[PDB]
Amino acid sequence: QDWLTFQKKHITNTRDVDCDNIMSTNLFHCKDKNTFIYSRPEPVKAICKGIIASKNVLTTSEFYLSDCNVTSRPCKYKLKKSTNKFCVTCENQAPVHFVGVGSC
DSSP states (O other), rough: OOOOHHHHHHHEEESSOHHHHHHTTTTTTSSEEEEESOOOOEEEEEGTTTOOOOEEEEOOSOEEEEEEOOOOOOOOOOEEEHHHHHEEEEEEEHHHEEEEEEEO
């Protein structure tokens, strides 16, 4: 919904996201999936440079992604690492929503 919340929800400082731990917190409340971007914030913010009105943008470069995908056991996850482009909603020059992997 805003750049502060996007960083908390979708940017990780460690590739090996501790899914069963973090996914169980209020922010994610045991949901089935969450894509995290392994980067410091500024190169991710930079995806949106110059874009004022809300617009979905597919990244120009690929990033390191870490996904927490639920297993058959509620709130227990597999961590899956991949490299791909992703789509975010840019608004007033920052990412405010994560849209999806690979395509808008």
